[PDB]
Design an enzyme around this catalytic site. Structure first.
Site, PDB file in Angstrom:
ATOM      1  N   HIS A   1      -0.702   0.461  -9.949  1.00  0.00           N
ATOM      2  CA  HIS A   1      -1.442  -0.429  -9.069  1.00  0.00           C
ATOM      3  C   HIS A   1      -2.045  -1.591  -9.862  1.00  0.00           C
ATOM      4  O   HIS A   1      -3.260  -1.753  -9.976  1.00  0.00           O
ATOM      5  CB  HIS A   1      -2.525   0.327  -8.291  1.00  0.00           C
TER       6      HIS A   1
ATOM      7  N   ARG B   1       0.836  -1.194   0.000  1.00  0.00           N
ATOM      8  CA  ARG B   1       0.000   0.000   0.000  1.00  0.00           C
ATOM      9  C   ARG B   1       0.874   1.248   0.000  1.00  0.00           C
ATOM     10  O   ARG B   1       1.971   1.267   0.570  1.00  0.00           O
ATOM     11  CB  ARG B   1      -0.939   0.009   1.199  1.00  0.00           C
TER      12      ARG B   1
HETATM   13  N1  LIG Z   1      -2.053  -4.859  -6.595  1.00  0.00           N
HETATM   14  C1  LIG Z   1      -1.463  -4.752  -5.433  1.00  0.00           C
HETATM   15  O1  LIG Z   1      -0.489  -3.977  -5.366  1.00  0.00           O
HETATM   16  C2  LIG Z   1      -1.897  -5.629  -4.272  1.00  0.00           C
HETATM   17  C3  LIG Z   1      -2.668  -6.743  -4.548  1.00  0.00           C
HETATM   18  C4  LIG Z   1      -3.023  -7.598  -3.515  1.00  0.00           C
HETATM   19  C5  LIG Z   1      -2.598  -7.349  -2.217  1.00  0.00           C
HETATM   20  N2  LIG Z   1      -1.847  -6.269  -1.972  1.00  0.00           N
HETATM   21  C6  LIG Z   1      -1.442  -6.024  -0.593  1.00  0.00           C
HETATM   22  O2  LIG Z   1      -0.818  -7.162   0.011  1.00  0.00           O
HETATM   23  C7  LIG Z   1      -1.222  -7.210   1.406  1.00  0.00           C
HETATM   24  C8  LIG Z   1      -0.939  -8.590   1.988  1.00  0.00           C
HETATM   25  O3  LIG Z   1      -1.795  -9.534   1.380  1.00  0.00           O
HETATM   26  P1  LIG Z   1      -1.711 -10.961   2.069  1.00  0.00           P
HETATM   27  O4  LIG Z   1      -2.861 -11.769   1.527  1.00  0.00           O
HETATM   28  O5  LIG Z   1      -0.276 -11.471   2.025  1.00  0.00           O
HETATM   29  O6  LIG Z   1      -2.074 -10.552   3.587  1.00  0.00           O
HETATM   30  P2  LIG Z   1      -1.885 -11.548   4.861  1.00  0.00           P
HETATM   31  O7  LIG Z   1      -1.982 -12.987   4.444  1.00  0.00           O
HETATM   32  O8  LIG Z   1      -2.831 -11.048   5.932  1.00  0.00           O
HETATM   33  O9  LIG Z   1      -0.390 -11.268   5.345  1.00  0.00           O
HETATM   34  C9  LIG Z   1      -0.090 -10.071   6.059  1.00  0.00           C
HETATM   35  C10 LIG Z   1       1.250 -10.242   6.767  1.00  0.00           C
HETATM   36  O10 LIG Z   1       1.664  -8.955   7.246  1.00  0.00           O
HETATM   37  C11 LIG Z   1       2.117  -9.055   8.595  1.00  0.00           C
HETATM   38  N3  LIG Z   1       1.808  -7.921   9.468  1.00  0.00           N
HETATM   39  C12 LIG Z   1       0.621  -7.322   9.700  1.00  0.00           C
HETATM   40  N4  LIG Z   1       0.762  -6.351  10.601  1.00  0.00           N
HETATM   41  C13 LIG Z   1       2.069  -6.340  10.956  1.00  0.00           C
HETATM   42  C14 LIG Z   1       2.907  -5.574  11.882  1.00  0.00           C
HETATM   43  N5  LIG Z   1       2.345  -4.608  12.620  1.00  0.00           N
HETATM   44  N6  LIG Z   1       4.211  -5.889  11.985  1.00  0.00           N
HETATM   45  C15 LIG Z   1       4.759  -6.857  11.248  1.00  0.00           C
HETATM   46  N7  LIG Z   1       4.062  -7.620  10.377  1.00  0.00           N
HETATM   47  C16 LIG Z   1       2.739  -7.395  10.226  1.00  0.00           C
HETATM   48  C17 LIG Z   1       1.428 -10.251   9.269  1.00  0.00           C
HETATM   49  O11 LIG Z   1       2.063 -11.004  10.301  1.00  0.00           O
HETATM   50  P3  LIG Z   1       1.425 -12.385  10.899  1.00  0.00           P
HETATM   51  O12 LIG Z   1       1.590 -13.463   9.851  1.00  0.00           O
HETATM   52  O13 LIG Z   1       2.307 -12.513  12.118  1.00  0.00           O
HETATM   53  O14 LIG Z   1      -0.022 -12.167  11.149  1.00  0.00           O
HETATM   54  C18 LIG Z   1       1.255 -11.130   8.017  1.00  0.00           C
HETATM   55  O15 LIG Z   1       2.395 -11.995   7.877  1.00  0.00           O
HETATM   56  C19 LIG Z   1      -2.672  -6.679   1.437  1.00  0.00           C
HETATM   57  O16 LIG Z   1      -2.947  -6.192   2.731  1.00  0.00           O
HETATM   58  C20 LIG Z   1      -2.626  -5.636   0.323  1.00  0.00           C
HETATM   59  O17 LIG Z   1      -2.388  -4.337   0.882  1.00  0.00           O
HETATM   60  C21 LIG Z   1      -1.480  -5.418  -2.958  1.00  0.00           C
HETATM   61  O1  LIG Z   2      -7.062  -2.573  -4.625  1.00  0.00           O
HETATM   62  C1  LIG Z   2      -7.066  -2.941  -5.835  1.00  0.00           C
HETATM   63  O2  LIG Z   2      -7.078  -2.075  -6.747  1.00  0.00           O
HETATM   64  C2  LIG Z   2      -7.061  -4.425  -6.204  1.00  0.00           C
HETATM   65  C3  LIG Z   2      -5.715  -5.095  -5.927  1.00  0.00           C
HETATM   66  C4  LIG Z   2      -5.341  -4.973  -4.448  1.00  0.00           C
HETATM   67  O3  LIG Z   2      -4.545  -4.164  -4.100  1.00  0.00           O
HETATM   68  C5  LIG Z   2      -5.997  -5.908  -3.431  1.00  0.00           C
HETATM   69  O4  LIG Z   2      -6.493  -6.989  -3.837  1.00  0.00           O
HETATM   70  O5  LIG Z   2      -6.020  -5.639  -2.196  1.00  0.00           O
END
Ligand SMILES: NC(=O)c1ccc[n+]([C@@H]2O[C@H](COP(=O)([O-])OP(=O)(O)OC[C@H]3O[C@@H](n4cnc5c(N)ncnc54)[C@H](OP(=O)(O)O)[C@@H]3O)[C@@H](O)[C@H]2O)c1
Ligand SMILES: O=C(O)CCC(=O)C(=O)O
Ligand SMILES: NC(=O)c1ccc[n+]([C@@H]2O[C@H](COP(=O)([O-])OP(=O)(O)OC[C@H]3O[C@@H](n4cnc5c(N)ncnc54)[C@H](OP(=O)(O)O)[C@@H]3O)[C@@H](O)[C@H]2O)c1
Ligand SMILES: O=C(O)CCC(=O)C(=O)O
EC number: 1.1.1.79
Lengths: 312, 312
Positions: free
Chosen positions: A275, A227
C-alpha cells in the site's frame, strides 16, 4: 482562524508548522482527547469520533484521496459529523503523478514481456520472444476520476488503445467511455490490462470477482491500485491458476498488512507492494488545503468535495 | 532501378514485396552466392564479402542501427566496399520508441523500489520503504544520438534531472551536455542511473569498466542497451557484489547468446533480456529506405550516413 490537526502516523509537528506558515493568521494545534476548545477547520485521517462530534466546523479535510474509512465511521456514528459540515479530500496533491509512475512502469513491463524473460532468466535460458502489439493491448481504467484520468493520459502517450468506466460519461478525446453496470460487460471484453482506480463504496465492494475476471480477454493483467475490498482474492487466484490472468500487481488487500498465509505472496504471477502506490506529498497537501480555505472564504466555487449520499 | 536484398534471418519474401510496392519502378531480388548481375542499391545485414565486393553501388543500407559489424568486416576486407559507395543505416524506424519503452519502464521500476519490494515479497514480508527523490536520481545517457536523445526526452517528461555524454556538445534545453573523455569523470559523478546508448567503436570498447563504475554514486543502476563489448562483465559483477551498483539490466553481452556459465544469469541484482531492446519495424524501415533513395535521386541533403573514418 483555528485549525485542529490529527493524523495517526504522519509528522504532526512538521504539518503544524507548515500550515502555520501557509496560513499565517491561523492558530494550528494537534488534537488530543479532551480538547473541546473552538475550531473552524479540522484536518484528519482516521479521526476518533470525539474529535468531530458536536462541532460546527466550517470544513473537514480528510488527509487522503480515499474517504471510505471516514464515511463508514460516519455511517456507524451519525453524531460524529453534522450534515452542515462540508467534507473535502485531497485531490491529486502529487498522487496523480505517483499513480502514473506505477502504472506506466508495470504496463510497459508486461507489454515488453519482462515477466517472461525473468522466468527464462531463472533457468539461464536465452530465447527472444514474439513482440506484443498495441492493438492487442487495450487498457481499461475502472474508475475515471482524478487519478484515473491521470493514468489514462500517461498511457495514451504510449499509444495504447484506452477505455474507461465510470458512472457518468467522459469526454476524453481518445478514450472510449463506458458508463454504468449495463455497459460494464462490454467494457471488460477488450481489457488486456485492467487498472482499478475506483473508490471503495457499497456499490463497488467485491466488483473484481469470478464473473468479472472471466469476461476479460485471455492472458489479461490486473493492476489494483484502489482498495483491497474491490478484489475477491480467491477468485483472482483461480483465474491466475487457470491462465485467464497472466499477471497481477496488487498494492492493496482485504486485510493490511496482507497476512503471511495468503497464497498471493508466493504466487509466481503476483507482484505485491505494501500500500504505497500514491501517498500525498505534505507540501502539496498544505498548498491544496490553504488554497481551498481561501477560496471558501472568498465565495469561489470549490469542487473537491465529498458527496455523503453517493459515497465518494 | 535494381535492388539486391540480404538478411540472414528476417522474412526475406515479405521485405522484397514491400520494397516493390514502396518503389514500384524497382526490381528487387534476394541476393544469393554467384549473383554478379547489376544492382544500384544493396540492403544488407551481416552480408558476405562477395555480395558487395567490386560493386559500384549507388548506396548500401545496413538494416540496423548499429554498424559495428559491417564496419569491422570492411576493415578486415577493404575490397568489400569501394570508398565511392555511401553507407547508410536505419535511423530510428521505430527503435526510438522501443528504447523509450524499455528505459522508462525500468528507470521507474528502480525509482519506485520495485526491486526491493520483490526481495521482501520473496519472504512474505510487508514493509513500506522510504521514497526516493528525483534530486537524488539524476540520469546520465552515455551516447546522445538518435536513440539517446529519444530516451532523454521521454525521461525528462518524468522530471528526472538529466545529463548526456557524447563527442560533441548538445543543446537540449534541460539536459546537461558533457563532451569528450576530459569531461567523462564529471559526467559520471552524479549518474544515479547510467544508460548506455553508444555505438561499438574502437574508442568505446570496454568503456564500462572498474574505473568508470567506481566514479558513479553509490547504489547506482546500469542499463546497457547498446553493445556487449562496452561492459567489462567481471568488473560489473564486482561492483554489484560490493554494493556499488544496486541493479543492472542488460540486453547485450560480449558473447551472444550469453553462455549459461556466466555469473550474470543468476546474480540477484541482474536482469537479462536476449538482445531485444529495439528491433527495426520492417514497415518503418521500408519507408525510411524508399524515402532516402528518393531524396538521393532529387539531390536533397540526407544525413543518416555512416562516417567510415570516425567509425559510426
Ligand atoms: N496508495 C493507494 O493505493 C491509493 C492512493 C490514493 C488513492 N487510492 C484510491 O483511488 C481512489 C480514486 O481516487 P480519485 O481521486 O481518482 O477518486 P475520484 O476522483 O472520486 O474518482 C472516482 C471515480 O470512480 C468512479 N466510480 C465511483 N463509483 C462508481 C460506480 N459505482 N461505478 C462506476 N464507477 C464509479 C466515478 O465515476 P464518476 O466520475 O462518474 O463520478 C469516478 O470516475 C480512492 O477512492 C482510493 O481508494 C489509492
Ligand atoms: O490510505 C493510505 O494509506 C494513504 C494512501 C491512500 O490510499 C489514499 O490517499 O486514499
Ligand atoms: N537491440 C539493441 O540492443 C539495440 C538496438 C538498436 C541500437 N542499438 C545500439 O545503439 C547505438 C546507438 O544508436 P543511435 O542510432 O543512437 O546511434 P547515433 O545516432 O550514431 O548516436 C551515437 C552517439 O554516441 C556518441 N559517441 C560515439 N562515439 C563516442 C565517443 N568516443 N565518446 C563519446 N560519445 C560517442 C556520439 O556523439 P556525437 O553525437 O558527438 O557524434 C553520438 O551521440 C548503436 O550503435 C547500437 O549499438 C542497440
Ligand atoms: O543487432 C541486432 O540484433 C538488431 C538490433 C540492433 O542492435 C541494431 O539495430 O543495431
Amino acid at each position: 482562524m483555528d485549525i485542529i490537526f490529527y493524523h495517526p502516523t504522519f509528522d504532526t509537528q512538521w504539518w503544524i508548522e507548515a500550515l502555520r506558515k501557509a496560513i499565517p493568521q491561523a492558530r494550528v494545534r494537534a488534537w488530543k482527547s479532551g480538547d473541546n476548545d473552538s475550531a473552524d477547520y479540522a484536518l484528519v485521517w482516521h479521526p476518533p469520533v470525539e474529535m468531530l462530534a458536536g462541532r460546527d466546523l466550517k470544513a473537514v479535510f480528510a488527509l487522503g484521496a480515499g474517504v471510505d474509512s471516514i464515511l463508514s465511521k460516519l455511517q456507524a456514528h451519525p453524531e460524529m459529523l453534522n450534515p452542515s459540515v462540508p467534507l473535502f479530500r485531497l485531490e491529486d496533491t502529487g498522487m496523480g503523478e505517483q499513480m502514473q509512475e506505477y502504472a506506466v512502469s508495470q504496463v510497459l513491463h508486461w507489454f515488453r514481456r519482462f515477466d517472461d524473460y525473468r522466468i527464462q532468466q531463472n533457468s539461464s535460458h536465452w530465447q527472444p520472444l514474439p513482440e506484443y502489439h498495441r492493438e492487442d493491448f487495450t487498457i481499461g481504467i475502472l474508475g475515471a476520476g482524478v487519478l484515473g484520468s491521470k493514468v489514462a493520459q500517461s498511457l495514451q502517450t504510449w499509444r495504447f488503445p484506452l477505455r474507461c468506466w465510470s458512472r457518468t460519461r467522459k469526454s476524453w478525446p481518445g478514450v472510449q467511455s463506458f458508463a454504468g453496470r449495463e455497459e460494464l460487460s462490454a467494457f471488460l471484453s477488450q481489457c488486456r490490462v485492467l487498472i482499478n482506480l475506483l473508490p471503495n463504496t457499497p456499490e463497488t465492494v467485491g466488483i473484481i470477482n469470478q464473473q468479472l475476471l472471466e469476461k476479460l480477454p485471455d492472458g489479461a493483467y490486473l493492476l489494483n491500485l484502489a482498495r483491497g475490498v474491490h478484489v475477491v482474492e480467491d477468485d483472482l487466484l483461480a483465474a491466475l491458476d487457470s491462465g485467464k490472468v497472466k499477471g497481477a500487481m496488487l498494492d492493496v488487500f482485504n486485510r493490511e498488512p496482507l497476512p503471511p498465509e495468503s497464497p498471493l505472496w508466493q504466487h509466481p504471477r503476483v507482484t505485491i507492494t505494501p500500500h504505497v502506490a500514491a501517498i500525498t506529498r505534505p507540501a502539496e497537501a498544505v498548498e491544496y488545503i490553504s488554497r481551498t480555505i481561501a477560496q471558501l472564504e472568498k465565495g469561489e466555487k470549490v469542487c473537491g468535495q465529498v458527496d455523503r449520499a453517493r459515497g465518494y
